[PDB]
């Protein structure tokens, strides 16, 4: 079942735009916020837009982008906090501590700017 990724930072929802742009919106009625998370191996997930089929990804520079096809850049390690919120570290750049994240202004954070413990990297999966 699809879900919404609620960032505790600015209260935005992870959003994947049709132009491949990733960001966040506070509007629960937006069309590109509905995500279908699927597991690959244990503790691993794919995060995809049901409205576009685009997969969430992070490039070699640490930028999140929308991938029309699933690949290594699309794998994230889902880690659950007791609070129910989750973190999504880049599987490919896990050694560098590159997480999926949103700034207070909805803008997406860059890998190198992310750090374990920031409010920017915490997402609460909500029903759609």
Swiss-Prot record:
**UniProt tissue specificity:** Predominantly expressed in kidney and brain. Detected at much lower levels in heart and skeletal muscle.
Per the annotation, the residue ranges of the short sequence motif Nuclear localization signal are 1-3
Changing residue 85 to A has the effect of:
No effect on integrin- and heparin-binding, loss of FGFR1-binding, defective in inducing FGF1 signaling, cell proliferation and cell migration
**The UniProt record lists the keyword tRNA processing:** no
Tell me, what is one Gene Ontology molecular-function annotation carried by this entry?
S100 protein binding
Q: Which GO terms describe its cellular component?
A: cell cortex; cytoplasm; cytosol; extracellular matrix; extracellular region; extracellular space; nucleoplasm; nucleus
Q: Which UniProt keywords apply?
A: Acetylation, Angiogenesis, Cytoplasm, Developmental protein, Differentiation, Growth factor, Heparin-binding, Mitogen, Nucleus, Phosphoprotein, Secreted
Q: Which GO terms describe its biological process?
A: activation of protein kinase B activity; anatomical structure morphogenesis; angiogenesis; branch elongation involved in ureteric bud branching; cellular response to heat; epithelial cell proliferation; fibroblast growth factor receptor signaling pathway; lung development
Q: Where is this region: Heparin-binding?
A: 103-119
**Annotated consequence of substituting residue 109 to A:** Loss of LRRC59-binding
Entry's localization field: Secreted; Cytoplasm; Cytoplasm, Cell cortex; Cytoplasm, Cytosol
Using the UniProt record, give the first listed, main subcellular location: secreted
Asked if the keyword Phosphoprotein belongs to this entry, the reply reads yes
Please tell me where heparin binds in this chain: 9
Per the UniProt entry, the effect of residue 104 to E is: Reduced integrin-binding. Defective in integrin-, heparin- and FGFR1-binding, and defective in inducing FGF1 signaling, cell proliferation and cell migration
Question: What does the PTM comment of the record read?
Answer: In the nucleus, phosphorylated by PKC/PRKCD.
This chain's function reads: Plays an important role in the regulation of cell survival, cell division, angiogenesis, cell differentiation and cell migration. Functions as a potent mitogen in vitro. Acts as a ligand for FGFR1 and integrins. Binds to FGFR1 in the presence of heparin leading to FGFR1 dimerization and activation via sequential autophosphorylation on tyrosine residues which act as docking sites for interacting proteins, leading to the activation of several signaling cascades. Binds to integrin ITGAV:ITGB3.
Subunit composition? Monomer. Homodimer. Interacts with FGFR1, FGFR2, FGFR3 and FGFR4. Affinity between fibroblast growth factors (FGFs) and their receptors is increased by heparan sulfate glycosaminoglycans that function as coreceptors. Found in a complex with FGFBP1, FGF1 and FGF2. Interacts with FGFBP1. Part of a Cu(2+)-dependent multiprotein aggregate containing FGF1, S100A13 and SYT1. Interacts with SYT1. Interacts with S100A13. Interacts with LRRC59. Interacts with CSNKA, CSNKB and FIBP. While binding with LRRC59, CSNKA and FIBP seem mutually exclusive, CSNKB and FIBP may cooperatively interact with FGF1.
Similarity field: Belongs to the heparin-binding growth factors family.
Q: What is this protein called?
A: Fibroblast growth factor 1
What is the originating organism of this protein? Homo sapiens (Human)
